[model samples]
Target: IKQGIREVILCKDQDGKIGLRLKSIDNGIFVQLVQANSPASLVGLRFGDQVLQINGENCAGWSSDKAHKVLKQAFGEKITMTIRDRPFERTITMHKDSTGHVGFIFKNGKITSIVKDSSAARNGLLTEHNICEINGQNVIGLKDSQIADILSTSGTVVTITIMPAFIFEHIIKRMAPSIMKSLMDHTIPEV
Candidate 1:
């Protein structure tokens, strides 16, 4: 058995974009983001997955700069990554009150606020925890409105899957937002 290790092959698109991002935390390097429709996303790379090796070179303790340098140097060559899945995933169940509120405010699948002493608070939902799934459905790539619809439409008894957002936010703040912004920037001017 392969256990928890995963092998992923990434190739750049015509735009020279793999649409993947990496970040280092503490002593390890982790996948930070996988843009939709990119080769990275097509091959199933995921956020929070630790990068152990890249192109046969050890990646432990690698900083973002080093990772970026290596990836860029690969050019049009196929890049192979050895990864380990995230280990701290948690799932919890909560009941909505008669008011139909789960006691949390979210944006883009992240828990932005949790009401004091409310279902979210009582059930261990915390601010900055990214909601990965609701009622067993994966939430990736869904717009904020669509995410809200799923949460609001579910029955009283709802299940949630979440992971800590510290690494996510940390990576967000350190990395340039250009990749994310550029995707939206073209929408207005092109059409």
Candidate 2:
């Protein structure tokens, strides 16, 4: 039940609608779907899918403050969610959260860039570098969206290996900051 949580800033799309956005995948009860062109849509969720049980213990209506109590008892358990699909009832098996990978960014057909000053960037990682492995696990054929889903559950010191490239420096300079800010928040000391 050692759950990780973060605050995020969402943006207004072209239609001028705004929704909650995730800063990182380290914490919280919500899960975002990112499998493009797969059964799991980019925004796979359709609302009202909050967790209700982990291996059968009631977890619905629990406050963020109580996340630990719920997670501690639920970790590694087969999670079952009572998702509220419109006009009907449905149940889905929730996957165990992956808690040990660094998230990356992709644009076009390239890896683009990672968050600057982040654990990945500090390790001399670069934009346009094709991610070959995460913690020695091959991630080829995985879309950027799916990769994001996996990273959201990961924890400290994400290990990544990528194919190196340099021609994308200019493009990275323009994109890295926004992506980094979107990925990490400025941590302020508690009083």
Candidate number of the best lDDT? 1
Superposition error at 26 for model 2 (Å): 41
lDDT of 2 by residue, 55-75 (tens): 455555554446444433443
Per-residue accuracy of model 1 over 61-178 as CA lDDT, tens digit each: 8889899788888856688988887544577899988888888888866889989877888987877888766765556546778777887889999888777786556655655556
lDDT of 1: 0.72
Worst 10 residues of 1 by lDDT: 182-191
Error of 1 at 73 (Å): 1.7
Error of 1 at 90 (Å): 3.1
List residue ranges in candidate 2 displaced over 4 A.
1-104, 165-191
Q: What C-alpha lDDT values do all the predictions have?
A: 0.72, 0.36
Candidate 1 RMSD to the correct structure: 6.2
Lowest lDDT 10-mer window, candidate 2? 86-95
How many residue pairs clash (N, CA or C atoms closer than 3 angstroms) in each of the candidate models, in the order given? 0, 9
